Amino acid sequence: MKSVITTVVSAADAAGRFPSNSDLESIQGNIQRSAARLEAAEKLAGNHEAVVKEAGDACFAKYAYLKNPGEAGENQEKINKCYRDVDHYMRLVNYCLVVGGTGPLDEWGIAGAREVYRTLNLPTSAYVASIAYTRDRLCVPRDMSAQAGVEFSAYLDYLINALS
Amino acid sequence: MKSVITTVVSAADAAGRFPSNSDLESIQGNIQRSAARLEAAEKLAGNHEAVVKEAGDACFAKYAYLKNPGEAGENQEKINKCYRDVDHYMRLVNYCLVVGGTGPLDEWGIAGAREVYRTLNLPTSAYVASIAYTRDRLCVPRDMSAQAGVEFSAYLDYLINALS
Amino acid sequence: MKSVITTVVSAADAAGRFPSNSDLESIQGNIQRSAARLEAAEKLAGNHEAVVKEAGDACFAKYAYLKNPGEAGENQEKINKCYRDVDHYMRLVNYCLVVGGTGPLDEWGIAGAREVYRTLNLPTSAYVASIAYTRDRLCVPRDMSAQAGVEFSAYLDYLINALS
Amino acid sequence: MKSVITTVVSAADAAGRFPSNSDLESIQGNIQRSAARLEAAEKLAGNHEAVVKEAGDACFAKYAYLKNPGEAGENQEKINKCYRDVDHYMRLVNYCLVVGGTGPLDEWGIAGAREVYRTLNLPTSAYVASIAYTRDRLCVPRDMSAQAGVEFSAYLDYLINALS
Amino acid sequence: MLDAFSRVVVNSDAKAAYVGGSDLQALKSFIADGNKRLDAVNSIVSNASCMVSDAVSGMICENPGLISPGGNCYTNRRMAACLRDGEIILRYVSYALLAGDASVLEDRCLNGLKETYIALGVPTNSSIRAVSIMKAQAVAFITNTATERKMSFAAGDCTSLASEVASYFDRVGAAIS
Amino acid sequence: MLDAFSRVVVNSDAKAAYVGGSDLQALKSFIADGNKRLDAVNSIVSNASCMVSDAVSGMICENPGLISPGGNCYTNRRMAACLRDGEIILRYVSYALLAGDASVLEDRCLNGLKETYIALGVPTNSSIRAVSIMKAQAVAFITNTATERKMSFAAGDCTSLASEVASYFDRVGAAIS
Amino acid sequence: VPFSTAVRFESPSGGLDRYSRVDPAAPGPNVITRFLFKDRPVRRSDPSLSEVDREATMRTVYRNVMGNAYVMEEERAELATLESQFLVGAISTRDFVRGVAKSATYKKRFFESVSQFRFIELNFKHFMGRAPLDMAEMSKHYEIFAAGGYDAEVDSYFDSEEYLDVFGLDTVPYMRFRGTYAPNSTFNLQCRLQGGWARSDKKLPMMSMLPLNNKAAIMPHQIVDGLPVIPNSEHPSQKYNVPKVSREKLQRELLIAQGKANALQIELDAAYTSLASSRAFLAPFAAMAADMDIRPLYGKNPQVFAGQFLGVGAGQWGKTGADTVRGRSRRVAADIGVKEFQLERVKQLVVDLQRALALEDAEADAPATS
């Protein structure tokens, strides 16, 4: 779980040191940025099922070949797993805005994903079309505030650079 | 050196990762707390001749056996190399308030100090009695602010806990 | 436990070797030199309460600052633990004359001593003035023989060279 | 070269130590035993033309089978190389009595001998029959002193146990 | 390892729920009192060399058999490896005070510590009354009621941080019991 | 490891006693019989190749089921791994006789030897026989009563050194029962 | 090998006996540990390597890098290409041990003859000289094996910064006894894995799975087998002095010694409540004299005559120093130290009783008559 606190303790433990002034100075920047990304987290916590119906078919309108026979998404029990997977990925971005780091996206969503989708014949570009549609559908004074949409759209393209 | 920037870059260099959102959040705390610690740096840089002269003869008013023949501070050249060394230690405290971490005290003042002072028969209680006078002579609204005096006296007893 | 026997058994066990002629030749020097060091071991075992009392207040007549409040001779339990330590060191020199090597001073008196004396704030120049008092009051025809003095004094400044 | 010198130096260097009293007492037995083994050395260095003639014909009497046509001991120019080999083994035993250890036998006579004598089809039973005869021919008051025949005979059966 | 915010995520991951609005009311009061938490670990780390020498030499005041021959704090290799171990325990307690959660103490320090101390011959009852001297030292340094050193703080009330670091110290003595 | 000199030291370190006059006289008699002991261990390491071939062939000469298919010393590779267990047991006794103590026998030679022998499937009683054949050989060289090799010594009697090396081979067989 | 891994995990820890690069003239750890009671590690420092140091080097290779096995005179012919180049100086000590680790000798013993779970166990022991730190570090190496197989997984250790900061290019690897450990439970696991001087690795089962997931605790007698042996103890072990009695007589003598240790604990706890009651008895008066002016007549400044109380006089300092101090709390403290001696004596007696029960149950689970 990579956060701000679990990387200044894990660096102080790796040299056998007490927490010094540079370790206490990094928790202060976790306090200052906490008003921004917790505004973005409660925006995502109520509005999560709207933005995954909006971003799920943005994959399917770009890629209509998934509903071909022989392909990834034929029947209705496979389309709903694709809308399950975007809600899995949007929940972990809500977890990353709480802990203040890319911890819960890493071990729960990113690690091992490039061998899951490669073996189970899922195209990784159809995942990234759902995340990148959500990146520019955000309106920076309307939905959240200005720098609170900075850290919402900073964890979104960390997921985009990881998936490809 | 050891600071906020050298910690999160080296932790990402070991992992082989780009500087992500957890790393920039910690250098935001280097923006907020630098107003306190750089006030104490320029208060120490403009007053250092009077505070190492005061702390040096607190060492010799307490351990008066050092001026005996065959002991440490015998002649005047050997007393003047003590005030040379309290001036080196206050200058590394001033370099630590600038950088934002205990790195300049670590690499240049503390590493190897146990091996050197044992082999040259220099008492480490004499160096601690100079630093502990300066930590108690500090007055929190007269000499600096209340937040500059808690950064200055947190690098002083980093040096007391590393010598002793 | 570095003796003549354990330094040649462990040499022969490392190469997978039986005890050959170079191994037995070194035990003949353990026979030929034991008459000089067991004569110093029996003079130490029969005179030790007078030689660690005389060396124990060589520390306290030289360094009168230890009796100060907060300092390192302040109550009577602290003075009684000072003469205990000179009695611990002169027992370990006596064990080293018996085994013929520096092994009991190594593992029982010297290993870890500079970490303990720094943490508990004990001046290691006050230990050296006890040991060098004993090394310089030895009268080589009155107190032992001539070559018993060179075995007694050799383990005495093995202790001065390792404590400082 | 395993003498008594290069095992106390080579074990103080593995621990990073000065030569102690354990290391000087090994060299004291080198002064005691050198009056016997150097007396046995120059007894061997004058007599060596007749001992290696005595060592060679003992295995041609014990194993007279080598002079068959087709297997090993064919001609006189082979047999003159067999007197070359037992003179070399006596020359190394003379070198071990000057070293004071099993040094020159180990690296010039023993190492690789299990491969040279095997692939050239040389039975080492003929070498032990050549050299146990010189272990038994030693009359302890006629040839040398009492303990000078101890250290002559103890390097000889080290060579017997290494071959067979 | 976890911190205080990774602890509330793995509770919410157990029900596959989003970290909503009612449980953000308590997280905003954690970060509002985050300046007292940094002001509290700074009063432990500044005093940390004298804390493990008041404690190990106060353990000897209640047990002279440690400094008897054969004892556990008897020789110089053995007193140095006990003063080493007393400040490892103070290091991982101050990590969990800083992280807000005791997960780094329970698996990197306290797991397997009891049967480590059986095998070396360490008296585990003397360690419990050694780490309980450091428990009383830490709660005197948080609440600024040590008698020989006072530090300069702002006005207020840090009693909840005192009984959070007290519960990290009786979590040590439950593991070596 | 310890020797005969540092056994007196670690028994007096438990009492915090200096090495006095009574136990110095038992150590002064160790050095006066020191030339007997170097004469004793020179007898065993000179004959050590014949002893491990007289031992494990005579163990096979009494137990002929060890070379049947389904035996411990059946093949050629396992025979060399019993010949290597002859000359390591004989090596660590030779260090123990030279030192005058059984420390190097206890913490190196017998340390973990039984637990290895369970896991490999070594016959327990056949290792007691081959060690005791080496006990029958070792006292035959200390008392100079060997059948086909006579070694020349000085005038005297060494019945105490032959009893000490007999107790070392019983300590080998007591540990692998 | 320029990428060597693929995973964005959370980083595990290191050791502490590493090359620091700041203060490189420092002893650090391994001056107060069980490093002092092992034999010192062998590093190549001379270019020649005389033939009795060549044999002494390869004995450390078979003991530490191999699993204290025996190399025959045919299995040492498989290393004869690699003993060209180590003895000349063309390859290092680190490149020699990797060439040993890719032999047909090592691949027959430690890869095919054992399981896959046992093969990952020994690579932390034979090459790094420790245990797995946790299950996260061990499960990384199943993915390094899943990418590139054997020689990708073997090169993960020799191409590491934790290797070259400790062993460098010159020292043969060894089991490390440093002071501070990365979890505490990796100290117990490395004593289980490398335990006893005469113990091999042939036909042992897999050990380090159920400790690393907190399923099976390591018994304290299995750590005592791994630790190097010190001369002095408070309680020397009856490992060799247990008599050969049955399995049922060992079970009765264990449960008696566990019961005596439980009753000795709950009268040591009654001693601690009497020490806490003795201090509260005198705490109104210890603080009453805390702010009195107690000036003596002699003993502090040297200008007055003090007699024997310049220090203390002639044998009166005691065996300890605390035995010369009188008081109600010092007198109940000496009762604590005599009561904790009898508890520690019988807690070390249930350790070697538990060893003899396991060493008789290994006889029963092996195919035998009992």
Ligand SMILES: *C(=C)C1=C(C)[C@@H](Cc2[nH]c(/C=C3N=C(/C=C4\NC(=O)[C@H](C)[C@H]4CC)C(C)=C\3CCC(=O)O)c(CCC(=O)O)c2C)NC1=O
């Ligand atoms: C025997 C001679 C002996 C003892 C008995 C034991 C006394 C003792 N002291 C404590 C408590 C503390 N030690 C503290 C440490 C320090 N005080 C300081 O100000 C400096 C910074 C530092 C030393 C370097 C502190 C703060 C306390 C707490 C009390 C307070 O409010 O001051 C205990 C703990 C009681 C328990 O068991 O719970 C004991 C027994 N030390 C001896 O040397």
Ligand SMILES: *C(=C)C1=C(C)[C@@H](Cc2[nH]c(/C=C3N=C(/C=C4\NC(=O)[C@H](C)[C@H]4CC)C(C)=C\3CCC(=O)O)c(CCC(=O)O)c2C)NC1=O
């Ligand atoms: C079967 C074919 C067979 C045996 C059975 C076994 C007979 C045997 N021999 C001994 C005793 C010794 N072996 C010794 C070794 C040597 N004797 C020598 O003369 C040379 C120097 C050396 C060989 C290189 C020695 C010294 C003895 C002791 C007595 C003796 O001198 O004979 C035993 C041990 C007795 C016991 O069981 O306690 C046995 C069983 N060998 C076979 O080949």
Ligand SMILES: *[C@@H](C)[C@H]1/C(=C/C2=NC(=C\c3[nH]c(C[C@H]4NC(=O)C(C=C)=C4C)c(C)c3CCC(=O)O)/C(CCC(=O)O)=C2C)NC(=O)[C@@H]1C
């Ligand atoms: C030039 C490269 C750009 C540009 C940059 C500006 N950015 C300004 C302000 C700004 N940026 C952030 C977010 C930043 N701070 C953080 O702590 C983190 C991550 C943890 C990030 C990414 C914030 C919060 C702010 C506002 C600062 C404030 O409120 O004071 C900025 C204004 C400067 C200033 O106000 O100090 C500029 C000019 N702007 C541009 O037009 C180009 C493209």
Ligand SMILES: *[C@@H](C)[C@H]1/C(=C/C2=NC(=C\c3[nH]c(C[C@H]4NC(=O)C(C=C)=C4C)c(C)c3CCC(=O)O)/C(CCC(=O)O)=C2C)NC(=O)[C@@H]1C
């Ligand atoms: C309880 C432990 C104490 C106590 C704590 C309080 N501290 C308060 C304010 C405070 N402390 C600091 C310094 C701290 N922040 C850092 O970044 C670092 C090191 C890098 C340290 C040591 C600061 C900056 C502040 C001010 C924060 C603010 O006022 O906004 C404080 C005031 C209230 C509060 O901050 O919540 C309290 C009560 N004070 C006590 O009386 C006990 C002894």
Ligand SMILES: *[C@H](C)[C@H]1/C(=C/C2=NC(=C\c3[nH]c(C[C@H]4NC(=O)C(C=C)=C4C)c(C)c3CCC(=O)O)/C(CCC(=O)O)=C2C)NC(=O)[C@@H]1C
């Ligand atoms: C939707 C935009 C995709 C798509 C998705 C499908 N995914 C299928 C299975 C699947 N996905 C995951 C990963 C997911 N589970 C998690 O727990 C997390 C993170 C916390 C994530 C991202 C897993 C583990 C599985 C297998 C188990 C399951 O069914 O949930 C799937 C079914 C595959 C099949 O039946 O063959 C589909 C169809 N497919 C699309 O059409 C676009 C690319």
Ligand SMILES: *[C@H](C)[C@H]1/C(=C/C2=NC(=C\c3[nH]c(C[C@H]4NC(=O)C(C=C)=C4C)c(C)c3CCC(=O)O)/C(CCC(=O)O)=C2C)NC(=O)[C@@H]1C
């Ligand atoms: C006064 C407190 C003491 C005392 C001081 C002496 N220090 C001596 C030498 C020394 N000190 C250092 C460490 C110092 N040099 C640095 O560069 C830095 C950090 C940037 C520090 C803290 C070094 C490397 C040396 C040796 C070289 C030198 O002379 O400057 C010293 C000389 C030793 C001697 O010649 O005996 C003295 C006298 N010691 C005393 O006598 C009083 C009590």
Ligand SMILES: *[C@H](C)[C@H]1/C(=C/C2=NC(=C\c3[nH]c(C[C@H]4NC(=O)C(C=C)=C4C)c(C)c3CCC(=O)O)/C(CCC(=O)O)=C2C)NC(=O)[C@@H]1C
């Ligand atoms: C007198 C010259 C000093 C002095 C002596 C003190 N030593 C104290 C503690 C201490 N000393 C040792 C080393 C000692 N113990 C050994 O077992 C051996 C070798 C066999 C030696 C040399 C240890 C391990 C300890 C801690 C345990 C103990 O109490 O005995 C000590 C107590 C520390 C304290 O209360 O502050 C004293 C007083 N120190 C002085 O104050 C004068 C200068």
Ligand SMILES: *[C@H](C)[C@H]1/C(=C/C2=NC(=C\c3[nH]c(C[C@H]4NC(=O)C(C=C)=C4C)c(C)c3CCC(=O)O)/C(CCC(=O)O)=C2C)NC(=O)[C@@H]1C
């Ligand atoms: C011969 C007299 C026995 C017998 C012996 C076998 N032992 C085999 C392997 C083996 N032996 C040891 C113990 C040895 N190593 C030490 O380090 C020490 C003391 C410090 C000693 C005594 C070990 C550790 C091993 C296993 C490692 C290895 O393979 O060398 C063995 C081979 C077993 C197999 O077939 O795999 C045999 C046959 N068997 C007998 O009949 C007599 C009683």
Ligand SMILES: C=CC1=C(C)[C@@H](Cc2[nH]c(/C=C3N=C(/C=C4/NC(=O)[C@H](C)[C@H]4CC)C(C)=C\3CCC(=O)O)c(CCC(=O)O)c2C)NC1=O
């Ligand atoms: C086991 C180690 C051991 C020692 C190192 C000495 C140390 C020692 N020296 C003296 C004691 C003495 N040492 C000397 C000095 C002398 N200088 C000379 O030139 C003369 C040769 C010699 C006198 C004969 C003198 C004059 C005294 C007398 C008392 C005194 O000075 O206090 C005493 C007190 C009484 C005595 O025993 O003599 C002791 C304990 N004794 C020991 O038991």
Ligand SMILES: C=CC1=C(C)[C@@H](Cc2[nH]c(/C=C3N=C(/C=C4\NC(=O)[C@H](C)[C@H]4CC)C(C)=C\3CCC(=O)O)c(CCC(=O)O)c2C)NC1=O
């Ligand atoms: C940047 C580092 C830095 C420091 C730590 C201080 C250190 C310091 N303090 C004082 C000087 C002083 N400090 C005090 C203050 C006090 N005395 C008390 O007993 C009260 C507790 C407390 C009141 C708040 C007083 C009264 C003097 C002047 C008298 C004297 O001590 O000489 C002086 C001498 C002149 C002066 O500057 O005032 C110096 C150098 N100055 C520095 O430049």
Ligand SMILES: C=CC1=C(C)[C@@H](Cc2[nH]c(/C=C3N=C(/C=C4\NC(=O)[C@H](C)[C@H]4CC)C(C)=C\3CCC(=O)O)c(CCC(=O)O)c2C)NC1=O
């Ligand atoms: C300084 C150390 C040193 C040694 C220990 C010996 C070892 C040694 N012996 C031989 C070599 C030899 N040794 C013999 C001897 C014999 N072969 C027989 O046919 C008989 C059975 C037996 C008589 C005893 C013969 C004939 C050779 C020549 C090679 C050959 O066997 O064909 C060689 C090959 C070189 C040569 O021809 O001399 C070497 C290196 N030489 C050394 O320089």
Ligand SMILES: C=CC1=C(C)[C@@H](Cc2[nH]c(/C=C3N=C(/C=C4\NC(=O)[C@H](C)[C@H]4CC)C(C)=C\3CCC(=O)O)c(CCC(=O)O)c2C)NC1=O
């Ligand atoms: C440095 C090594 C060295 C040796 C090992 C011997 C080896 C040796 N022995 C003899 C030769 C001899 N040695 C002896 C002596 C004895 N014969 C016995 O059977 C008895 C045990 C003993 C007398 C009690 C005798 C009688 C001869 C002549 C005949 C013979 O060989 O037996 C000779 C011939 C010339 C001579 O006597 O020196 C040589 C070279 N000489 C050496 O220089």
Ligand SMILES: C=CC1=C(C)[C@@H](Cc2[nH]c(/C=C3N=C(/C=C4\NC(=O)[C@H](C)[C@H]4CC)C(C)=C\3CCC(=O)O)c(CCC(=O)O)c2C)NC1=O
């Ligand atoms: C992760 C966390 C972590 C720890 C908590 C410590 C735990 C720990 N302590 C010791 C090792 C030790 N621990 C003690 C401790 C004591 N004896 C006493 O009197 C006291 C009751 C007590 C502490 C003051 C002693 C004396 C030794 C050395 C054993 C000896 O040599 O006698 C060792 C063995 C170290 C070695 O030798 O290699 C370990 C693993 N280390 C860690 O890595």
Ligand SMILES: C=CC1=C(C)[C@@H](Cc2[nH]c(/C=C3N=C(/C=C4\NC(=O)[C@H](C)[C@H]4CC)C(C)=C\3CCC(=O)O)c(CCC(=O)O)c2C)NC1=O
């Ligand atoms: C370098 C290696 C080395 C050796 C091998 C020995 C060699 C050796 N042993 C003895 C001396 C002796 N050796 C024995 C030994 C024996 N007599 C017997 O009847 C037993 C059969 C047999 C041993 C078991 C006896 C009884 C003495 C005489 C006792 C003595 O001299 O102290 C002596 C004479 C000592 C003297 O002159 O005082 C020597 C040099 N010494 C060494 O330094």
